[model samples]
Target: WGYDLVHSLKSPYIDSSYRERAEVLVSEIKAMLNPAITGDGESMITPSAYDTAWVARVPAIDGSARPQFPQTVDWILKNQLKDGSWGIQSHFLLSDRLLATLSCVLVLLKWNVGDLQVEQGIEFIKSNLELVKDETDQDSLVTDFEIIFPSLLREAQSLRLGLPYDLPYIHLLQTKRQERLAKLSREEIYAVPSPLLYSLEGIQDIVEWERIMEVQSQDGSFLSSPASTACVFMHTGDAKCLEFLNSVMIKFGNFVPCLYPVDLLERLLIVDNIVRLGIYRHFEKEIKEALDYVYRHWNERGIGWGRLNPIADLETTALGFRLLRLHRYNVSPAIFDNFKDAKFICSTGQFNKDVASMLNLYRASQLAFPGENILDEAKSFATKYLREALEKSETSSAWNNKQNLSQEIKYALKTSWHASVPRVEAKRYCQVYRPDYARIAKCVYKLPYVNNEKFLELGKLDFNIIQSIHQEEMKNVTSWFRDSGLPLFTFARERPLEFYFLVAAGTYEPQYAKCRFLFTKVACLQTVLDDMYDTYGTLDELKLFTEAVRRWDLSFTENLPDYMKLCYQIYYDIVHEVAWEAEKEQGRELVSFFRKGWEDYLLGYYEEAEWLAAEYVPTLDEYIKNGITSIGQRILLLSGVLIMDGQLLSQEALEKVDYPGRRVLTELNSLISRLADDTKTYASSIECYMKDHPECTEEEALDHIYSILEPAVKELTREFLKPDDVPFACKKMLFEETRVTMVIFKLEVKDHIKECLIEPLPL
Candidate 1:
């Protein structure tokens, strides 16, 4: 939902960078809305999922279309409005009402309409103010009339900021009319309604809302004139009204998760995120109620975007995960197993096709909605786009988030393979840092030296099974790292703050990998993990992930095990003993900077290794003290560390996350959380998967995830004996650093610092 998600869906990498890519992609989308968008190409037809008139610009149009914006507008003009509004289609026979109004307002705000054209519409609204109630459904005449105004108001505000009609007009010309209530106590002034919903939540005091909280319809939901939901949201910070609306959304009958799937999904995600932020104590009951609604209507048949009645989309199932922002659940393999071949999903979710409409969901929110930070908004827009992108390819492909990508595609060598140097480094590092690694760690943790049985025979019977899995995995990881793995970073490339990132990511990777160990805790852990942290984790973990992933060791990996002797050997052979001996026994030029900590300097990779076993593995957040929530940084840095120094599991399944998949998931998760409802918590919503609250903490989660992988890692580690089976063990490249060409490739010695050394060899 953060940055990784954008790339995962758009670029075929891990989905971690989805949010970041979404920002760029959405910017590209916004450029299309501009009349002077230089070289990015045309913005054209493709009916949007939220509204039919909306068109996505990514050569990636939805449905069928002629490729140009002008043509699209012309087509729209042919379908003008009864009240000068501009939406192309609508429900309740309001085809041209608010929908049409919103369309025209947007054209003027975003396109080339004259100021006079805009004013005429404003004049029209003022003239018809009486016709539109501040927040009323008194008349059944034509909904678009009363509702259209609110949307118009919102559309204008988003355009060029300095408006002919600004905040003053918004306040004075309130969309909803004030009504005399039955001895009311609290009155929410922003309960005005636009097609998008008009209500001021924070702008109006809580005491004020409670005074008139009872202006409800027969269904116990607040009533608003104009009755626009988003419009009120735009003008006033009236989250309370939204909460009320959501609570009552299903009070009268069966509600829709796909009506305006975007809204439904958005409401679900947005409110939940808001709740997670915990802005108000008043939000608790309302938030829980909303979650209850989702739980009650969780369409068993669907997991996609468009679900109605008896039919449901499996993709939608992913959408409902917003509730996790409010709840935490135990994770189990059944979670992933349940959705493995989810058939009732949409074309994108089920067929793995990128549907333009779903992709545009993110774009429209930015161009049309325009709230808070454009980057964040753009990220939100990308969430759905990226989610759909995930349907096409499992691995997210992009340059930035290479580190986290490995975790998303952890089942095999094919999934972990990468061509980018930085990515492979990032991937290697992140494997140890990510939280769900347990899934694959199960295959590699207790990795074995395929050629030796001494360690394998000395262990428990169960350890043998783990060792068997580890040896197989070692083959895949080593092969992938050497023959096909993406090279994220290599050869001691000096960079800024490398150690900080190396430390952070180097530390965090193991936590992400812990999902493998999550098996014992819940039968549905995988999917549950996806729901809670996939979106939020991407954002929360990014900064730390990115920083760590940016820096990696100069040595390329030579297949290290996840535990014990193998990794210990890599550590010992590379620097601890040899490097230590070189400094003590031989003359050395330890510089002014390297004097006291010469050995420490020799141990930068060691620092990363220490952190993997230290801070990050135990404590996930560096954000509280740093003021930068580390979702992106951690991802980048972690991947770098993995590619640089983490052991490569040699299994055909790869048993490791690819750099892109991690990147994709990180990016996408950050973005999607924006659209998530603020009602649920990580603990509460994951019940189906977790079955109960998890002992939530970096250490607890990591330990749990690892416990599941422990069995596999133990087995893998026991039999490990080959020079290559050490998880953190030094590789051929590390040896090459001694001015020795033993592990040399055609590249300079510096090139050997990461998984790059394996690039010249066949696994």
Candidate 2:
């Protein structure tokens, strides 16, 4: 009943104006996703000047010596920056600017137009050519700079642009191009889909146009690359290539992106951002639609950013796999096999592997199910690669924005999917995520939908709103604790905030405020009971208390000591009160189910007390069988289900928790939580294992515990994939609790509570 007051009680921490702005931003984001869901339009990305210039240089299909898309020429003429560069000006990377500038100058020279703009562009290139070599080592270079830039240089020479051709840096650039070219086989390019297809424009002179057209993507572009398709059309006059370019021209007018149709990447990234921002509760419908679109295009060979793309890359495929699997779609871990070798490759013909893709692979691999060896290998390889990259401070040029690269990598390395708390991740991401961050391909480009300022704004506002509610919930919980008289037993660990954080950080929606309060109270009381049994109470006292719990009557506690009486009375009143509420809501006799959960929990504690009293160290198996239930996660999870929605509870689901051998959702949840808790404490399952096998070192004992934890986690993942009578919301809570356990043990628990509950984001 105290929790019922939480909705009417407004927090002093939340500003009315902040709440209003957050609502407006949520509506705006929902509207942004509407067109895509309604099938009214396609994905949109910022146009690339380099690709646009390439499209402009295509000759007429008919026997005329004129440009096919002359409007592109007009676009090129009007879009040059004040410095005469034709690329993203916000972040000045010399490679992207020089490449775009040279391509724009070459296209202008071919059209014999914009002489003044052309002269200025040539001066920009000549002035910056000396610095081009310096950018060669940077991770932010445009894709295939070694091949594409030199090809542009040859085109510049052919046009007789009267630029500095004798510069030694130019010769060095030419040699770099030759070395890359020597590694490419024309046979390999023509036979299968590879990264080379995306950069066909750079190797246009050597490849047969007819053979190249044979490998073009379904969307009529060559590997979804506008410049490559445009270049192919220039030589082969293939109608499909022309059609692809025309569609791009129609959508973007004159300037086009480095890639097109980006439907998969766009949808996947939007969902990824919305979820990571912790605002996903506002856009569940839109996210389902986005992931549904991805599931439709998912393939055995994996997938690239665009569905129409015939080739698959590790970055897009890994991101898609992680999201789709999280949504419970039917996808295979074998899909990752295509990208794995000694190490994972982004795609075939990739000269360098980027950190962003491997980071994605690492995240995806964390979702592996039982016996998914490919995912196992992927996790191993990606972990090593990412750690090495972190050591060297390497950033991915393929996916630009090195500003937060190290921070992002460290977070991913530290917090796995199983351990990641949505709100905590969202709070950190809101601070570091830059909407204007451009990704490098043939040129730098931005996906407006994926990287929007509105998403970040909404994330910050929503986080603070939820934090306000959590702060209020913690206040109510502490007040209730003080009123309950449990703190009089100073031996108990009085950790209301920590217990509330375990629930709040996992399930922080505003609507779940009551659940947060009820669950935290139960956990707090359970902790007191645990301390009474383990540390304070004698054997006879614990037996009487455990028997009183089984009897479920106030008179049954008459024989117990004063402290035991208070603990039993408090525990009994709260459990019966919640169960009564749940029974009224469900219109069924649910009190037995609630009592069974609590009874099993207390019995496990009593069994542990008996073990300690007898000076017995149970074997690893014996300890685990009782240890799982003793951890108290199952009852905590069941209480969450009852408090949130009693209709989700069923006899079948209840039996899974009562019977540990079932290995269902609740069992796995308790297993992971128990093992993670044990690793951090002495006289735990780890100690029991070491005692059982005296030859095992402490290191080996910890390793053995982790080995069991790993498979249990994998088994937990498999449960979500199959159809079952267990409610999804209940399973998710169990999973969230498991994840929170991991975070509390792996990271600093006190810091996490402060960040999620106490701190507010800077608006």
Candidate 3:
């Protein structure tokens, strides 16, 4: 029975204490999802010294000489680095440090305090001011640096800080600011909401304050920018502006981030992390709540990081759009129209393109259903842009550099959305996920809710737990294969581990252990059956085997060859066992359906064998009609549907396989499988197409075959989105099976199998 073989195959990678550690971490992560702990629902982001300095400089509302937020001023005094810079300690960007240092110096100079600290800040600025020119020339300066930094320098001159304003670099800085200001009109800034609203503090000398209030975000901030809102409050004394500043002060405790109320971005990123980490199964309710909150705020113009933001950005909108459409929300692809111009931009008036935003756009555009031409255009542009970026090794400094941008983009480009399996992606994501990579805007900042060590630890532990279970299943399946006598056929591909990997990676949850086992067994048997027809058997032997499978009776196998007898007996017993298990568990009779499915599968194989024996190339239509069943995915999918819970096993649900929508769904899967397999193997449908169209070259034939693949996938997407009689589980399983097939064909199966089944993530 091979029990001893199974027992001896213990997994050396299974740590004895993994389950306990995983449970503890799971509980800790679940606790973080509670609304109470996620108070005010604002993002947990690192404070910005530049924005805090702007807030600290606001005069008292009581008309006194003191600053309104004196605590913010104290925060600046304490946060300056030992080198006299005031910016992210983890990284050094000349633009970020210079702007922060100069802003802090201005605040201290206004209050006539910290003369020593002010002098050091001034010295740091004068010393590093030349690097700003170098950064600007390199095109690596932070966002709005041209407009904001020159304004700060003018303020420094007014305070008599004795900075070197006469240097050539300073003159270039003044010239750059003028060039940026030349692009904006006062009517354009006041009549409509724009990116300019986020940087009003830099252009305050030219703006109409009362008119600016008309374009304020519903949250009372200027494009959700703390410094911009603070600047508005200082000039106008508007109550709403003061209210927005007070909200930031209350939430962040005397300091503020470059952006606040990042509700949309935080929620979207948290959900993305949970799903990609493979821990979303534990947080379904919480994830729904988070996405629902986003859906309620979803608009046609798209959304920014924060809700009710006057402007929308490509990064957050793309992230939100992908997640919402995936969860079956009714979001239009038209929301992407705002970002598209000559080419896609992150936001309007953006100085340069961002890699992260384009990556998300490429990801989002992949979810398009048929007839969404805008998304089709988006996919084309983003794909070209991202590949070019990868070729140049370009990284977006404004989006942060520690994220290993090239590696992330390479993964996205290699494995598209349609081909991405959840478990496979999770393993790759966990290996590359950097929790310390801060979000960059005006300066570097961290979103605690989005990037947390707890999520990473939990993801690793959960993946290892599932990997251990898969290892155990691998041992049992290998035992079953060894005991079955099927390996005696030297012509067949003996691949128990690969078969098991395909099933386990697709249906990876622990609750589906039985389903995973059964599906792998079917896959193994089917592979051997395919090899017998395609590679080894004589025509007479194939005829005997095909009839024997159609009859599905042991008595019919008596006249067959010895190898045929063994294959028949093994196939019969496993199919019977599967039927018995289904009847016992779900109180249903499924043997007839399984029998019919296999009978059709065998006939398709026998027909193909007949074609090969005669050296006859059938027409493309006849080949596809037979190829859909010959590929065996329909039966494989039916086998999976058999083991599912009672809802999918119901008589009506069982019969829905032949319904119009379900029929198209299965046929599309079959077409993609057959077409993709043809490209990889010889004597295929591609050959048939060439025989039918003799004038066409092989490349032209291949072009014809490849053309069918995209529309097939599009039709599959349309079927998935339609409301029909097919069970959602059955549809989802078929959809995922198609994805798994793509992954197997597109990538190195051996490497993926090793990563998913053999390797466990290190603690």
Candidate 4:
């Protein structure tokens, strides 16, 4: 939405060198898309030893003496590490190494090949299995390790291979498996489709082949899990099953992961990372293609990790619903309605127990529309569930042993996706994400097909470039502020760079450098003007200043003080400056609109001062009515819309400001900004509510204000999601303003004023 994307890279012509690097990045991402995929194919998984072991065990359907896939066996023989592990050789973890080494050794022993290598693998498992039991990195525990490891150990006994069965760790796993199976009813396990089907390779004898076949995905897999589907194939020799294996092997080769066709998962997550990292503007087309691919495959029942399987889980569904809705897709909340009783009703289904799943649900539910009882309940359910999970997560091994849940939960709770500021979200996620392979055996920064590496590589470079631009602009804004000699007034927040950070965090594309410059200069003028009205200026002076703003005449500036004369002149010049630039690239005039914005902000300040002078305490109803306008939300948003999008001021946009009903998005956005401003503004609605009940404690009154806050946030999501009268570009600026308010609301004004201004982030 930062709209100056003239070229393929979506970058401004800031420099030829920067443009060249960005062009290469754009080309690299464009090349990663493969249109030649036939059927429901997967291209991202690494070879899974578990999958390879199953393929090795399959006898030829023609009853030949030779093994079914000799090359698969040869792949295993050729790729073994010196340490005797068969999984990823770098960034080693106990589970990947243990499972891969164990499975390969079993397959090799079964075929009477590589006897010496099998011995080395047994020793590798013997050494690593202890680390699995005593894992300090509890967050890194393999997804289905408890159920699957025991299955492999039992199979090891069946092969008559000598192994370390007395390690005490073996019995611990045996006990854990028994406890897990105890929770399952026969119906949920074998009589229907469930996530449990994905772990079928981990079960010894509980599977019913005919029942499982009924739940097979369209591509003849259960849950798109190759290891699980291979188990089914061995039991039944189902032709569809063999066909699936043949297709995926051709797509990804012998290194199939435990999950396959992770197409939906890969596309969504990769695009999501890039967007939240604040680097998505450069990859606009690629991001759209990736999201469009997801939108085409969208299921109202919600998506699983892949498109080939229609079975839905809450985590994937919530993320899909949130992302699609956020992008203004006309997806129905009815998709969520289908999942409600199944995912939320703990008695009917224990589906909500997963930490990551509920955390996603909690975040998604915040984007709910009014009267959507499903989201209301989902919000409550997930919030309570996550709070409880975090309390006990340290003691449990259910997560991937990463201890990442507490931090993630805390962040989501504090900053709902609706409320998150983009740059802050980017900075946080960049440092927190693990650099190792995710489900597809690809690091976020090292995805296959030249996909993410280029994006991430360029992201770092672009971030620094933009940082440098900001640094230079901040220097200019400072000199301008200093030249005005405004510090002599001593009644204002003197530092101007915080205003720059505020606008930059919201509209952060290098192309919009002019908008940022004008925006912060205006913001600086507004801040000083604001202080003069609220704390410094007398009532007579405020009335005179308000009159001068409303008049829109340079002659009105002559009678003011030297500092006031400078303020009026610079503000007037900035207005024409913005419109002058607008008229060059764009034809529409915005000088009057920009002037009107400043006048409204000044007028709003006057009204608030009048209220303060009377020492008035209004009722909640009266306070709520005036509170929104007093904060100047409308003035700022309208001005931002005009300035940010040069040719974007349509007749409909003006009408939206004229008519109350059509402008509800801005109204809701303004109300949120007002409420967020209330935290710092004098005579807040919080004070009104507290006065209404003098007996109530500040904490209790604060909760009352928060109760109102959630619904207001929900209302913003509702208005934005509806494809109604608001212009696309208009709504985006509205969201940006609202998002900036979230950071401002949670912030202490002096945070950047004291620190970042003195020592900014390095370029």
Compose the digit string of candidate 1's lDDT tens values, residues 485-578.
1122231122211221112211222232221111111111112222322232333242232232232332322222222123222322322232
Deviation in Å, model 1, residue 648 alpha carbon: 28
Instruction: Give candidate 3 misplaced runs (Cα > 4 Å).
Output: 1-17, 36-39, 130-133, 136-140, 341-343, 347-353, 390-401, 645-647, 655-663, 720-730
Query: Which ten contiguous residues of candidate 2 have the minimum total lDDT?
Result: 344-353
Q: What would the per-residue lDDT of candidate 4 be over residues 40-94, giving only the tens digit for each residue?
A: 4334645676677766766677887656667778788888888988776654656
Worst 10 residues of 4 by lDDT: 1-10
What lDDT does candidate 1 reach at residue 51? 27
> Ten residues in a row with the worst lDDT in model 3?
393-402
lDDT of 1 at 130: 41
The estimated TM-scores of all candidates read 0.22, 0.94, 0.93, 0.86
CA lDDT scores, all candidates in order:
0.28, 0.79, 0.79, 0.66
Look at candidate 3 and give me any clashing residue pairs. none
Q: Candidate 2 at residue 531, lDDT?
A: 84
